[PDB]
Each structure stands twice: as structure tokens, then as C-alpha cells.
Write a protein that binds this ligand. Structure first.
Ligand SMILES: CC(C)(COP(=O)(O)OP(=O)(O)OC[C@H]1O[C@@H](n2cnc3c(N)ncnc32)[C@H](O)[C@@H]1OP(=O)(O)O)[C@@H](O)C(=O)NCCC(=O)NCCSCC(=O)NCCc1c[nH]c2ccc(Br)cc12
Ligand SMILES: [Mg+2]
Length: 166
């Protein structure tokens, strides 16, 4: 009978459109490319929805994290489009907050909830992601440790790999 003020839940393929719209402004508008295109988000939201998390305000998505499992120490080009069911690493492919809602704890809150949520599942022993040099200190506030240049290639941008033990 009503839209909740704030709702945190795992995503489903139907949320595919919403997340892509957020990415268009968060990533594409800034680099001409984005972590996951509509098909790649549907993919992960189909095989591993439990590895995703979204914040909805009044029925609209305002923040999300899309992940999958990985089974290797470091991230590689192929990990970009894979889900290793037997992996013990939660690979965060994308983390973004809607333009009109940034700078007010949302990202930090979603990330901590995500960490505990995924860390609830005993199989998952670690969380990994790629990030721009300027966000390294941000992720360190969460227990992540810089782990050198990430091997993954994307246009001309450079990334530092971050590893967090759960
Ligand atoms: C970074 C987030 C998620 C944080 O959300 P917020 O709700 O604003 O965070 P808050 O909890 O309010 O706190 C924000 C803190 O982070 C800092 N911060 C936020 N944005 C930035 C920025 N652009 N530069 C430096 N610091 C920043 C900020 O200063 C603040 O600290 P403060 O308290 O001292 O002011 C938000 O700004 C956002 O959605 N930005 C746009 C998307 C983004 O940058 N996502 C994260 C990237 S790392 C994780 C990730 O998804 N990596 C994939 C890599 C990748 C793959 N393919 C690609 C193609 C293109 C591009 Br480009 C990138 C890729
Ligand atoms: Mg060039």
C-alpha cells in the first residue's frame, strides 16, 4: 500500500535497468565506459543475486553493489565476466551511489552492510575489488589493503587492487 522510506535488499534481474542508468552517469559519463553493461548485470543478478545489494528510497534504487565469486589470489581480465561457484572471494564488480544522493554516508553504509552480509556466508573468506588511486584511502576505512596495480585493463585508466579479509 506504500513505498518504504528506506529499503535494503539483494537485487534481481528486473533491477538491471535501474543499475545501468546509475552507471551511465557514475562511470560512462566520466570515462566513456562502465564496469557492467546491461547484459553483464543481468548475468550476475541471475547466477548470484545473493552477492548483490541495493538501497532503495521511496521505491527507487539509489545505491548498489554487484558482485560474484572468484577463486584466485589476484583479479585478472577473465574474472571480469566470470562467477566461480566454488570461489571463496567475493568480487565486487561495481559500487555506485546515484548522483543526487552522494556524500552522505550511503556508500559507506551499503559497503559495511555488504561486507557483513557476504561475510555471513562462511564460504566467502575475502572481498576483492579494483579502484582508482584516489579511493584507496576510502576503502582502507573498511579493512581493505592496497594490493598493488591491478592487472585488469580498461581503456587507459589505472586501478589499484584492494583485498579485505572477512
Ligand atoms: C565512491 C562512491 C561509491 C561513494 O558514495 P558516497 O555515498 O558519496 O560516499 P560517502 O559514504 O558519502 O563518503 C564518501 C567519501 O568517499 C570520497 N569520494 C567520493 N567520490 C570520490 C572521488 N571521485 N574522488 C575521490 N574521493 C571520492 C569522499 O571524499 C568521501 O570522504 P569524506 O567523508 O572525507 O568527504 C560514490 O562517490 C560514487 O558512486 N561515485 C561514482 C562511481 C564510483 O566512483 N564508484 C567506485 C569506484 S571503485 C569500485 C568499483 O566499482 N570499481 C570498478 C572499476 C571499473 C571497472 N570498469 C570501469 C569503467 C569505468 C570506470 Br570510471 C571504472 C571502472
Ligand atoms: Mg590513447
Amino acid at each position: 500500500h506504500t513505498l518504504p522510506a528506506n529499503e535494503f535488499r539483494c537485487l534481481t534481474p528486473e533491477d538491471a535497468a535501474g543499475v545501468f542508468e546509475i552507471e551511465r552517469e557514475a562511470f560512462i559519463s566520466v570515462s566513456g565506459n562502465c564496469p557492467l553493461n546491461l547484459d553483464e548485470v543481468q548475468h550476475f543478478l541471475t547466477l548470484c543475486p545473493e552477492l548483490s545489494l541495493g538501497w532503495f528510497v521511496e521505491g527507487r534504487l539509489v545505491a548498489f553493489i554487484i558482485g560474484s565469486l572468484w577463486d584466485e589470489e589476484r583479479l585478472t581480465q577473465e574474472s571480469l565476466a566470470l562467477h566461480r561457484p566454488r570461489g571463496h572471494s567475493a568480487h565486487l564488480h561495481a559500487l555506485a551511489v546515484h548522483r543526487s544522493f552522494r556524500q552522505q554516508g550511503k556508500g559507506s553504509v551499503l559497503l559495511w552492510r555488504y561486507l557483513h552480509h557476504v561475510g555471513a556466508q562462511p564460504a566467502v573468506r575475502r572481498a576483492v575489488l579494483m579502484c582508482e588511486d584516489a579511493l584507496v584511502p576510502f576503502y582502507q576505512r573498511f579493512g581493505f589493503h592496497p594490493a598493488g596495480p591491478c592487472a585488469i585493463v580498461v581503456g587507459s585508466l589505472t586501478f589499484t587492487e584492494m583485498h579485505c579479509s572477512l
